Amino acid sequence: HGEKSQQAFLRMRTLNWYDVQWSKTTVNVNEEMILSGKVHVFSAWPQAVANPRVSFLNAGEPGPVLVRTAQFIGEQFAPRSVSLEIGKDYAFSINLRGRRAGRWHVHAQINVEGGGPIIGPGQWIEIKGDMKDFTDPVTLLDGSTVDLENYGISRIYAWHLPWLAVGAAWILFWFIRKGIIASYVRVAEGRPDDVIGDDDRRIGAIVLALTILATIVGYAVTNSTFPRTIPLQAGLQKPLTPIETEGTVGVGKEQVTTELNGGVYKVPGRELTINVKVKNGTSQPVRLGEYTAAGLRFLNPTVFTQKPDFPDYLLADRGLSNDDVIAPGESKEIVVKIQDARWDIERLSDLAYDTDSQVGGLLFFFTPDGKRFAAEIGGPVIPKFV
Amino acid sequence: GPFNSVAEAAGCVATTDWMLLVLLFFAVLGGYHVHFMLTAGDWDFWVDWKDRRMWPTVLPILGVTFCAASQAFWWVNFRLPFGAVFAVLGLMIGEWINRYVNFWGWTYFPISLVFPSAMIVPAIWLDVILLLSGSYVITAVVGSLGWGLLFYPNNWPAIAAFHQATEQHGQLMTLADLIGLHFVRTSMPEYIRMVERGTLRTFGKDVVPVAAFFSGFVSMMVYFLWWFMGRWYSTTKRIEQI
Amino acid sequence: GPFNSVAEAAGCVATTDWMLLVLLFFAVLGGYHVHFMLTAGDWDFWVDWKDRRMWPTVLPILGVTFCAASQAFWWVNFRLPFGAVFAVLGLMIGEWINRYVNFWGWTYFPISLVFPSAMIVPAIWLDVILLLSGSYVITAVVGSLGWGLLFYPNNWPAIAAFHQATEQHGQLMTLADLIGLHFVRTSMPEYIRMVERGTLRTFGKDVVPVAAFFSGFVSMMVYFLWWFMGRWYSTTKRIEQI
Amino acid sequence: ESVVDLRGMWIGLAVLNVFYLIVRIYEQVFGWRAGLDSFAPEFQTYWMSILWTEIPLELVSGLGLAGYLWKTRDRNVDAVAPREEMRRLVVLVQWLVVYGIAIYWGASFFTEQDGAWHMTVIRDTDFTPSHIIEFYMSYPIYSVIAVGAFFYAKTRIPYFAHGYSLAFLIVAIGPFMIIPNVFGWMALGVFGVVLQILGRIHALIGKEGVA
Ligand SMILES: [Cu+2]
Ligand SMILES: [Zn+2]
Ligand SMILES: [Zn+2]
């Protein structure tokens, strides 16, 4: 949720989400599902957003309704931050584990360092059962298993509460053994000294000497339990592996290419019309299947005869069209008509408000058999008012 | 007095004494908590921000501020030796109530992820150094050095369990890191952190000891400044014009 | 008096009055202008710097400085309710004379490229908030909040013509961008600018409103400080040694 | 006569503390399935309804309370008997206790509560349920209460009348300088305020060997 309020051009020209899927939409407390998909980092990465050199994968979700059990991107377990390279594609997946009952919108999400959150597509997940039943658990190196949901917590209170109590007793003691007004008056009149003097200092010298003892003891005791400890493990991870299959923007002998040649989007607010100069570097006649923008899919009903498993919200069955197998080696300019309410609803139409009136995203081209060949589209587009 | 008896005199003194303690306690709690929350953050909020270098540095230094101001008020005007602990406990209570009732109670983050920094112990050191030598100058030095040094050890018993090692898909992690990854925060990417990440200029083995000594020495300055702040906030001046 | 009549007394008072008004106007103009020019720049100089975020932020904040000091002088010592407008008008005049006589008259940049920020309106709010409540404290708060808020809307009428859209070689531009590209400056590469360029942390639609509020709240502090500066610049102290 | 009453305080305390408790229960319930998506119509009915309502209510309550304490001010304040001053300034200390509580809820509870909410949403808007309560309710409330405390002191106690307590000033005005994003100048001048009260309690007895 909320991504609807981020600026269109930024959503469009940073991450181009695709093949995002959610494994299970329904799970009991303790049951896993994987959220997975792919991401193409847009080659004209905007100046407003720091370099995705320093980034983090995530499950957009309202607090820990599902617990993340591991995640991967690049081809790499990623508990720490990663580097995405401009203009390249990455597979990612998250394993999540049911914790609080309800119904929840769980997106793919990537945050870029001087950047902000970029929010990938999301799906409603029903989690049923009782949060009381939730467990991890998790294996230490010394062979034991802990339940992270509860682990360490009473040991915190066992240390925190007593001191908060010794805290109060020090205050009450002094307040009551010769008080506030009585003390204000003494100081303001003659000297204090009727307020403080050994044995008042003796008490303090004592209390201190106990305090440092209790501190030492608690320290040496906790080194006896827990004698081998590591510092937090932090730092960027080795460069990731991009998707080399197969494919797949700017990879292998067989490509599609798409130059944008100006475009028009009505304000307000449901249509975007674009001239695409396509080059078919493949050896097979290809039809345009799909435009994807900011999570959003605009499908060609001619190609997607019917009709994928994908969120509401989101899935638009009109990114028509013109049917004419672009021929192998051919080089043609086609007029594409993105129409659907979802453009307005996910506020891509608010592009007219931005400091950079310019689309980005991917186009998917299909052979007569299976193969999907991908091209980056992006560039200046002009608004046409009312 | 302006009192009908001695009984009315004593009954008034004891109950204005309560009201004043309670109003002062929650007044300072507010000031201290907002200030601290906005600065020491961040490192107090989150278990996997409590490293060997940053945390035991930023915390004692930002935390000594209101202890010094509170000592300035309580010692100068009443000779009551609980300014530090007064302020510190306030912070603790304000923090704990929130972590429990909200971080956990509202948002379901486990308390192992959101427990606050332990400060009562150094706060005590601070208070009794002032008591033993009714000098803010000796306190600003030896008092607040102890404030620094003491920080890490007094946290170690709450902290150490999370610094046990796990292996997760081939890669070492502390439990802290793991509680971090597990209990998903929407805006806490591992890189926004600001924890120790290594340097070529570290020799030892000495990470925590130097951070302790650093925080001791820097707190002295902050303590000197904030003592006087306490004095200026104690002002009984009237001004005539607005 | 030391006057030969009442006519000579009246004639003196009226003409020393003029001289003081004219010397004070041009004295404040000088200071204000140099300061403003060196800081608020830059945004004031160029139409393609007048964005939704930076300009309506830096300008009210840096601009309130001399208004507060001028109010500090005029209100404290005379109860004259024009300290802000006095300062602000001076700035406008110093600016406009220059844009017309020099930016245009010398270097032939069209006025649509070099016109100054509109400030009389917020200056008025500032002056009458002080007049209605002879309080600098109320003014520092509500007065200078209205100073901030009012900045953009009072500029809009002068600015909006240039926020009409044009298509140039397949790319959207404002007329302001165009006037910047067309009338070539030697040292104004699009990138030295410091205008809004977008962020992932913007939600709405709300860019100008939050800039307006931000400027109001920050100006309070600056107003407070600069009032007292006006006080200190008002000093009638003699010193004995140099 | 009784110099110490306290009824007013307990009334203010119960009415304030139950109120916030209702607000916390309200956010526990409508925090989820109302407050996660600010584009939804539920946000209008459950969250913006509070915001659009509370601002005017707090503004009217603020001006209305000041205006009242002023109209009902003691026009004959220099004439106040030692006993009645002692009573009036126990009432001040009452006001300040309510304000202590007000400051706890506003600056501790609801401010750090925002901390955990920032880790829950990605924010559709400036007006999250957290902010609506924290910035637009919780803070104005103790601001109002603070102005009341100040105004009561200015209109009932000779000392706080003719003067402006610099410390009390910082207390009443300081709030209007709280701003977040996107060290030390804070409100804590209650220190001065209570010292001035103690200055004044001290003077209302010459035969003080009894303490
Ligand atoms: Cu969502
Ligand atoms: Zn359990
Ligand atoms: Zn009088």
Side-chain angles (χ1 to χ4, degrees), chain D residues 90-161:
Chain D
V90 177
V91 189
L92 189 50
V93 176
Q94 269 170 250
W95 279 96
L96 285 172
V97 152
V98 176
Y99 158 88
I101 295 321
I103 263 287
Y104 169 75
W105 284 104
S108 188
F109 195 86
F110 289 125
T111 305
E112 203 180 80
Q113 171 168 101
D114 189 62
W117 197 250
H118 279 280
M119 299 297 127
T120 289
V121 294
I122 306 136
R123 293 180 79 247
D124 310 81
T125 178
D126 318 295
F127 313 121
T128 59
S130 219
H131 290 163
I132 311 252
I133 298 306
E134 161 198 30
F135 295 119
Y136 301 100
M137 190 192 70
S138 172
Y139 274 100
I141 277 173
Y142 79 78
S143 168
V144 164
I145 287 157
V147 165
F150 181 88
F151 259 87
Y152 178 88
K154 186 103 189 150
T155 54
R156 273 79 164 154
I157 293 135
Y159 175 89
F160 292 110

Side-chain angles (χ1 to χ4, degrees), chain A residues 1-3 60-62 104-107 119-124 313, chain D residues 37:
Chain A
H1 283 19
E3 83 276 5
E61 63 161 347
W104 311 110
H105 221 233
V106 185
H107 310 241
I119 307 310
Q123 180 71 280
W124 294 105
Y313 81 78
Chain D
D37 166 14

Side-chain angles (χ1 to χ4, degrees), chain A residues 61 68 77 79 81 99-100 109 112 139 141 151 159-160 170 180-181 219 223 226 229-230 233-235, chain B residues 17 48 52 79 81 96 104 108 116 154 156 162-166 168 171 174 177 181-182 184 186 190-191:
Chain A
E61 63 161 347
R68 162 170 47 195
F77 178 55
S81 62
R99 178 164 185 266
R100 264 174 94 205
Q109 153 178 346
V112 181
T139 298
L141 265 207
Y151 187 77
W159 185 254
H160 265 80
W170 177 253
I180 294 172
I181 299 175
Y219 192 88
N223 267 342
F226 320 120
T229 66
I230 63 172
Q233 297 286 114
Chain B
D17 267 30
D48 64 343
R52 307 187 298 212
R79 291 302 186 274
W96 269 118
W104 163 249
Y108 306 104
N154 100 85
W156 189 231
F162 308 100
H163 288 54
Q164 272 178 302
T166 192
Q168 293 299 120
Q171 160 170 333
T174 66
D177 298 306
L181 175 80
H182 264 65
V184 194
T186 65
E190 184 286 321
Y191 69 57

Side-chain angles (χ1 to χ4, degrees), chain C:
Chain C
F3 306 112
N4 284 346
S5 47
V6 152
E8 201 182 43
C12 194
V13 165
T15 81
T16 289
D17 267 25
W18 277 105
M19 291 169 82
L20 286 175
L21 191 77
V22 171
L23 89 92
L24 276 166
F25 194 73
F26 286 120
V28 173
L29 192 12
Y32 200 3
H33 204 188
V34 173
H35 172 85
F36 189 88
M37 176 192 151
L38 258 37
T39 44
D42 258 30
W43 295 272
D44 203 86
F45 282 10
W46 316 112
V47 64
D48 56 0
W49 278 57
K50 320 210 180 306
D51 71 309
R52 296 178 309 192
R53 189 164 196 279
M54 313 305 173
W55 171 58
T57 272
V58 292
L59 214 102
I61 285 156
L62 293 151
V64 81
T65 42
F66 281 70
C67 291
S70 180
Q71 275 185 337
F73 168 87
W74 288 107
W75 184 258
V76 185
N77 311 286
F78 311 76
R79 291 298 186 278
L80 292 168
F82 63 53
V85 172
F86 195 78
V88 140
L89 178 67
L91 179 66
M92 305 284 253
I93 280 159
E95 283 175 344
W96 264 115
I97 289 178
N98 192 61
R99 307 301 161 81
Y100 187 87
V101 179
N102 303 314
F103 280 67
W104 163 245
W106 199 21
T107 42
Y108 300 104
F109 293 113
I111 294 303
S112 60
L113 177 66
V114 297
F115 69 91
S117 319
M119 264 148 71
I120 267 68
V121 161
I124 291 185
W125 170 271
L126 203 65
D127 274 334
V128 343
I129 291 297
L130 188 46
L131 178 62
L132 300 192
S133 64
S135 175
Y136 65 88
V137 176
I138 284 150
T139 312
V141 172
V142 329
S144 93
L145 178 50
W147 166 261
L149 293 174
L150 280 166
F151 179 75
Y152 207 87
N154 108 81
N155 273 290
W156 188 237
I159 269 274
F162 308 105
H163 287 60
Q164 273 173 302
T166 188
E167 191 224 283
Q168 298 288 124
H169 290 100
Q171 167 163 334
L172 199 64
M173 293 187 74
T174 55
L175 285 168
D177 293 309
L178 213 51
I179 291 170
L181 180 83
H182 267 45
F183 299 93
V184 194
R185 300 153 295 192
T186 65
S187 310
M188 196 48 65
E190 186 290 328
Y191 77 57
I192 218 74
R193 281 160 131 164
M194 301 207 76
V195 289
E196 166 203 12
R197 268 148 179 120
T199 59
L200 285 157
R201 280 153 181 162
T202 308
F203 312 105
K205 271 285 177 96
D206 68 7
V207 179
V208 181
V210 326
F213 272 98
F214 187 80
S215 74
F217 298 136
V218 172
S219 302
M220 290 175 186
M221 276 156 84
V222 171
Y223 182 109
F224 255 122
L225 176 68
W226 276 78
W227 176 266
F228 289 116
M229 298 279 265
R231 298 309 322 269
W232 299 331
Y233 288 144
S234 276
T235 189
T236 55
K237 209 188 154 206
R238 313 176 310 281
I239 54 153
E240 320 302 337
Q241 276 175 310
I242 67 160

Side-chain angles (χ1 to χ4, degrees), chain A residues 132 134 147 149-150:
Chain A
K132 192 47 148 217
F134 182 75
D147 188 356
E149 170 74 27
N150 308 297

Side-chain angles (χ1 to χ4, degrees), chain B residues 189-228:
Chain B
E190 184 286 321
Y191 69 57
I192 212 70
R193 286 164 179 218
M194 295 206 81
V195 285
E196 157 213 23
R197 276 158 173 102
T199 66
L200 280 154
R201 281 159 181 156
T202 310
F203 313 107
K205 269 286 169 97
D206 66 7
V207 184
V208 186
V210 325
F213 270 94
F214 188 77
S215 76
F217 297 136
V218 168
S219 304
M220 285 176 193
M221 278 161 82
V222 174
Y223 180 107
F224 253 123
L225 176 74
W226 276 79
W227 169 266
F228 289 114

